Amino acid sequence: TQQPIVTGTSVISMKYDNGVIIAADNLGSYGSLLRFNGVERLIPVGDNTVVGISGDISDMQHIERLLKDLVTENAYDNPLADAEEALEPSYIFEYLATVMYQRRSKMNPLWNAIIVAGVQSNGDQFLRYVNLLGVTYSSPTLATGFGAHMANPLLRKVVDRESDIPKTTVQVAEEAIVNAMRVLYYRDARSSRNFSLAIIDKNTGLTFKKNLQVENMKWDFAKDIKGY
Amino acid sequence: TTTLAFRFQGGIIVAVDSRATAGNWVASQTVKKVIEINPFLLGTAAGGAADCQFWETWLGSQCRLHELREKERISVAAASKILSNLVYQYKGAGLSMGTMICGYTRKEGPTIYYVDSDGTRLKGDIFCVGSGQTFAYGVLDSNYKWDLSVEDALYLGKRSILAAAHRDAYSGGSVNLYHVTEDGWIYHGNHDVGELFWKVKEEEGSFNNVIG
Amino acid sequence: TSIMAVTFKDGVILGADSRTTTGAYIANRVTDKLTRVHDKIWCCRSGSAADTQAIADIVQYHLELYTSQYGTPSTETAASVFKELCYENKDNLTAGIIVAGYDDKNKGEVYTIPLGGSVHKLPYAIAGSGSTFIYGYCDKNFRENMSKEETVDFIKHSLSQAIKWDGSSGGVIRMVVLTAAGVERLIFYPDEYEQL
Amino acid sequence: TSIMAVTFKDGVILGADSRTTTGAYIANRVTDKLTRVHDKIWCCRSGSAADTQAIADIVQYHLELYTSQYGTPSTETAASVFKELCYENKDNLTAGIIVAGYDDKNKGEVYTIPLGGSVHKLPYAIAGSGSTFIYGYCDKNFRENMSKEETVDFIKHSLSQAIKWDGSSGGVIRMVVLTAAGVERLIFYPDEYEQL
Amino acid sequence: QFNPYGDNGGTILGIAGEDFAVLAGDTRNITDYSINSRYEPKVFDCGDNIVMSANGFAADGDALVKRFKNSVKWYHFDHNDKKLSINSAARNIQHLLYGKRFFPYYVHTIIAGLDEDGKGAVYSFDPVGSYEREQCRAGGAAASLIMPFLDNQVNFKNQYEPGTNGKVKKPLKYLSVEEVIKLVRDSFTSATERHIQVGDGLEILIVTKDGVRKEFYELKRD
Amino acid sequence: MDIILGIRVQDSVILASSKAVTRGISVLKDSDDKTRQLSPHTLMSFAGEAGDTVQFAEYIQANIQLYSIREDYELSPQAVSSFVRQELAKSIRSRRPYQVNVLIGGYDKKKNKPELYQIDYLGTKVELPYGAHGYSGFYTFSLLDHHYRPDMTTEEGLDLLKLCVQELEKRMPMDFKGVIVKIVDKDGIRQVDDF
Amino acid sequence: MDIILGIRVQDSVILASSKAVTRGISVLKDSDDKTRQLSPHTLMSFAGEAGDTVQFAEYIQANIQLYSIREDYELSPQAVSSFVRQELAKSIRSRRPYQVNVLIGGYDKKKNKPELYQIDYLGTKVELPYGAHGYSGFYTFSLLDHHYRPDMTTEEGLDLLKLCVQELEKRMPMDFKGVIVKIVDKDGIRQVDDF
Amino acid sequence: TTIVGVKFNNGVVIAADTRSTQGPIVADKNCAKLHRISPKIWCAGAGTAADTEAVTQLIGSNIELHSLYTSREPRVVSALQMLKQHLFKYQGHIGAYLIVAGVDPTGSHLFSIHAHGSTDVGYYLSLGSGSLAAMAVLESHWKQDLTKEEAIKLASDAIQAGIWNDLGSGSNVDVCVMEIGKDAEYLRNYLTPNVREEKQKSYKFPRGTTAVLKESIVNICD
Amino acid sequence: SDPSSINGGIVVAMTGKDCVAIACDLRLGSQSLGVSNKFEKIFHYGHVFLGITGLATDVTTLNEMFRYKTNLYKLKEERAIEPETFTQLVSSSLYERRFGPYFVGPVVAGINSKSGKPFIAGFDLIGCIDEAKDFIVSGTASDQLFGMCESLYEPNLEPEDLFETISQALLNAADRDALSGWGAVVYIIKKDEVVKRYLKMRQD
Ligand SMILES: *[C@@](C)(CO)[C@](*)(O)[C@H](Cc1ccccc1)NC(=O)[C@H](Cc1ccc(OC)cc1)NC(=O)[C@H](C)NC(=O)CN1CCOCC1
Ligand SMILES: *[C@@](C)(CO)[C@](*)(O)[C@H](Cc1ccccc1)NC(=O)[C@H](Cc1ccc(OC)cc1)NC(=O)[C@H](C)NC(=O)CN1CCOCC1
Ligand SMILES: *[C@@](C)(CO)[C@](*)(O)[C@H](Cc1ccccc1)NC(=O)[C@H](Cc1ccc(OC)cc1)NC(=O)[C@H](C)NC(=O)CN1CCOCC1
Ligand SMILES: *[C@@](C)(CO)[C@](*)(O)[C@H](Cc1ccccc1)NC(=O)[C@H](Cc1ccc(OC)cc1)NC(=O)[C@H](C)NC(=O)CN1CCOCC1
Ligand SMILES: [Mg+2]
């Protein structure tokens, strides 16, 4: 039985024609106090997977260490560690999903919501969710926390079903993600302006973008608003 | 549930309903609440459904192992005590079981044992167990005699379940009849309350509270 | 909320953020927490939005009726009416109100009214959830008889920090200047104050 | 508690008040919250006195044993041992610890460890009940690569404000300077810091 | 305090014919008032012509299906590749569920297939292992909506022969695969209208002696 | 309080009511009459919370007797039962409700028919051929479902009632010290002294 | 379970125990024997939590019978009672304690004296001239204080016991369906069939 | 519920979905959440369904009497003041969450009221269980100087976001446009994107299927 | 101690071609104990029919209350109340007891005598009106009724066909609920004739 102390908010993601995109802000909240501002909540595993984590940060750092250790263990007695027997997104996910459900079954959960985004060896897009309860699901768009309520509606206008994935480019997909991050900054009281974004493409590979900011914000109409 | 079993001149009658409930939701109307442990032993099920189903089939396995080891069919007393000692180990954990171990052996004769999940174990001639046990008692007690015929006893058991099936909201579906003699148990059919009620009402002239 | 009121040479200035929350969701990001109870008597509202609103409306009614009979009320009088409501209904209210006004005799005055319903006359006052993070800053930086530009900077820098650390505070920084000249509304957007 | 640790040009300085409370009663007004886990690795303790003490003693034992086998441990290593204890026993502990140390390669380093057991490497860190009141002040006044005298003033002014507003903080301001030169203990009495 | 259970919604439905059996289930997955996925299958081919679904709390549901699938695998290893009969699969599942009697799998489980005489079979379970073979069963959130409709249209309950003065019942007969799929589709569209946790899509798994076929149909996405 | 029964037959209504008054681990009285005559051809038996029962019964009795004097006329059993129901229906949403369940047995002289009404403390009224309150019903209803016929005589009704009391004495946990039986017919109300 | 009594007279110990087994609103059995013979001259009656009672009684019975076979000798009533007390004294600080109260009636053949021990579920032992468990004692103790004499015969003891049962049947709330009486003396244990 | 309000050039538009729920069950598939307070002042309601209906009628009644008393067309601020003072008095126990809009001699207005009696002002607002789905759309696409046709599109899009993504909202989109100098046009079922598909089968029973015990003519006349 | 499920019961209403149907079960119990099998839940005031499920004391009270109100209506208006108007009266009366409500689930049914239009409506305990073209459901087996009606129903059914549809909807819904059943009544309502049929159903 836990209670989360230092926490991270929304993680949002979606699929596009050649790969997947994932994003999450750089804030570590301590209740209402916006305590830590240099927190990276996207953690790459190899050159083909990114794990986005929300919830308790102490538990996030534990999961970081587990993934770090998983890469080491996979390399042992493995000549094809950087080729055919490299870690796939699906392997990394199933491992975490196993742990999450085992911990909830021992009544001592990792207080997190996790999205594993990546590209498989055969070119297929991988995007799947798992949380403290061990609940798993996949969808063209996935989001945690407030993201589930505000981001998903916007991202589903771009990719509403499976057939919309080939029709969606990386330019269109990234634009939707960046827009969603702005909406979350307007409306989520435990969000920050600064965030990180990652793209995993089947052709161009892993592109990790740090120190992004929400911009082109509409605040001007505020001056016209008076009392109640 | 409503289950009964009574001893009489011609052996033992055993009668049960067939309804399963999940609160006020009727989960099933076609459930088997009698388990045939062997050709001479029967077990009735009332209370939690998995608890009954799981542990009474388990009981049957223990009875089979007894006759393999001892080259002799287990006594009704010993069979009932295996089950009562088992639930006693789980006392407090929250098992819910109201059971009746009915059967015939040479040394005992026709015998009925009541066993429940608090560890109560009682030998006796008449028992009614389940949510509708009181309704069954009302009809059974007021019509019971030791000298009932096999035909009359079968009907009284059937009629007593019907009485409870009618009044008790958590009983119904159909009646499963059994008769236990010195030669073993004999199945006397499944009787749907949908037809049985009106058949009984018309022929017997009872159930005058209902709009005919 | 983060709110504050600061007296200075020419009068008094009220300041506030614009964030209203229902849990962690921001119900309104452009809220106006600075409200007029009289021509040159305003207040900052923190705590329950419904309670502070209902109180402010009753006070505005009382002072309008006061003005009809006895002319312009003092800032102290306004604070007393706020107190009376907050104190007598302390069990049913969650309202932390700062009252600020400009007389010509008394110049700028600030009265703060916490949860209990007590009154405290001060040179400057801070309140709301985000005020906790700026007690240190405001104490070290406040001076008496500041200019208008200095006081605006003092409030802007203060609320900027309160907003930065408090998740329950954010949006634009609204201000209201109360002097002999009249009433002036000021607004300051994130792109300016965030990078102070 | 009010506690803080600040990196600067020559190394790092730890700072703390001296007040220990059992409710509103001050059980010890001359407490030493700055504790040595290694020659030039120290920590500031906030939260439960018993928990932080028991942890610090275990860490001091681990680092002494580390030194016997592998030589001087890094400040990061020390922070990791603190984390391991705090994280794995999060359900039974109330400990907010700041770890600060001086390497010759890495110079001054500060790691803060809140209640959860997470680790955060920072240029400077503040913690304890009284830290809430100085987030605004410390953010506005901190600069990287400060001098010793500047950093001492920054800590002194900061903790002075934290002490002034927090009832759970007070007494003397103790400090510990960690540089290549060695270890220096500083103390500052109320008569000095109160009137800053 | 930490609550180890959750509700992922959705609903499932099993019908048995003479030489076939169907196991249907909607593809919507939810928590509270949010949609997690519009297509997240929960009806699975487990081998040996057995289809299975465990609806309720998905984490427990996936765990159970995973364990049963593994149970089938080890049954082959330990008993010379013998085919696991549907009745044997049912009893095995009872022990899986009852194994966690005092910390239950929060799921209503249904399996379907063919019995050893080649006839269609549907078994259904409570969360702690009690089970029963039936011609008909709905499970999950909308079970209370669908089940009575099935009693009426599959088992012909409350239906009498016209002009017989309510004396002769409508005779029981097996339904064709065409007629059964009609009932499944109508059951789910009706449930989608009146239950918020049901919608998006319908996936049916049909089981004959030839194997396991699939069919998919769109459902309302509101 | 505890056991109160009622059976309507061809020409009369029979009410049976237990004699025990228990409090804690002591049976304080074994000859208690849990009934009041509301009018010459209307009898009400009662059971429930201590004090409430008698206070309510006598209050109703006073009101019906007042009506009788005012109009020089006896209210029908149906009319009395509707009055009683409304009083209990008011009661349930009061500050402190009457926790009393009643059976109203009466003979309607205009219709020449016996009538039995069962009303619970919520104000839930039903006309029945046979009725009971409390745990008694869990035995007697099923028993009467079997043995009751609508065209029975008063003597047949008493034998049917003896069958109920015997079953209750056999299967009820508590000793209720037998019952007081009363018959309501065209000639009014009378008590059976040997039961 | 509920009513268990005990009376020690000049030459014997008499135990009376109720026959009812009740569960919910149903008397499931009315001929239950709430006792076990521990040894030829030692009898133990019991009452308490369902299941626990018989499980404990039989467990004790098994242990005493085991001792008898091992030593080819009968333990004294005092020795058996001390063994029983210690088992209950262990029990009370267990994870799930036996909630069983017992009376141990025995005849000591070495002393030629009857002995009655009352032990509760906590392991509280007392030797008494007369004893009872549960609510029974609230009536029987005062009654026996008055009517008991130490030099009474077995027949006088049975009449004294009849006086107790009559009082309990009059004033107890629950129907306990009479009692099974057993006598322990120099000639062993025997049951009174007509009580 | 999902409800929105959007301001434009020469007036204001409000919209709402048409789902009503009891627990997970859809009670009404086409209920009316847009309420007329006065001819040119309309109110969108979320929360306890009876409360939003009752409170809007009561204030609407008193507004009509006030309009007759003063010989003036009613103002939105009057409805706002009366609604908030009423709701405050009941300390939130009347669970009405309202978006109040309209045109009056002062101009065009848009407000929101919460159950406890707090009021907000804005150019675009959203309340209800799907307010986050709606607000996401509004924040993404809203701009200053919207036209009538653009505002209707934005408002209905914001409701659609709730319909599809929120389980507490569904069915159809109702709209009400209040332009200055014109009559307010109430567009009932402006969009109907959730039409039920043709059923696979007709369940019309053969006459005589149901068993009957008694028949009788009922007298409805005097 | 949940007022809406102590006594038990159900009501359902449907529209057809120039006709309406309303049906109810007959059970009244006290939790598990079935007490009465004659307890009708449908009443009528002139040509307007009202079904009421829920706590039985309130069912009786409200019937008596609406009889009271419709009788005064008729005396003052000099005409029978219409279904649309009566629906509004029910809603007002229920909301009058907002913070101490009647624990009921009423259902109005009837044909407007002026326009000839079939009309049905449902309410929650607190007064919220639920109008419908097709059908209304109420009671302890409302989930079951929703599922039956949503599948079995089709528009413009003839009175004789509509009888079969509503009867099968009620019967099969009732058999899946422990607190509902024990008999049933169906009202078929045409413009100027009303047929009342008692259904044969399983008595458990
Ligand atoms: C009648 C119907 C009253 O319940 C009988 O006791 C009946 C007996 C019976 C026997 C064999 C097969 C089916 C039915 N019992 C039930 O139908 C039983 C009622 C009951 C539910 C819960 C209980 O708590 C332990 C005790 C009795 N119904 C069930 O067991 C239903 C089908 N399943 C569940 O409620 C699942 N629960 C069981 C308890 O653990 C959590 C999951
Ligand atoms: C900051 C945001 C937080 O303290 C301010 O105090 C702010 C003040 C404000 C907001 C709008 C207009 C004027 C002034 N307060 C809020 O935004 C306030 C937070 C709050 C809620 C409840 C409180 O205790 C009763 C105290 C503070 N938000 C609200 O009042 C919102 C509109 N309403 C709710 O959250 C509903 N509450 C009602 C009271 O019960 C809890 C749910
Ligand atoms: C300031 C004073 C308050 O937070 C500091 O955190 C200070 C830190 C400190 C003190 C001495 C030496 C090193 C560091 N903490 C305390 O003074 C602390 C206050 C505190 C008590 C309990 C807590 O939760 C477990 C958290 C903070 N005081 C104590 O630990 C004193 C010595 N002990 C008690 O008050 C007894 N406690 C034991 C825990 O349960 C409550 C009663
Ligand atoms: C969406 C659908 C919420 O899911 C809307 O808020 C909707 C608003 C609405 C307005 C006018 C007409 C129809 C619908 N609200 C509801 O449909 C509402 C949901 C709700 C239930 C309970 C609540 O708090 C206890 C709050 C909202 N449904 C109802 O009010 C239904 C008709 N009634 C009930 O569920 C019974 N009420 C009685 C009053 O006490 C609470 C439960
Ligand atoms: Mg029944």
Ligand SMILES: [Mg+2]
């Ligand atoms: Mg101090």
Ligand SMILES: [Mg+2]
């Ligand atoms: Mg939706």
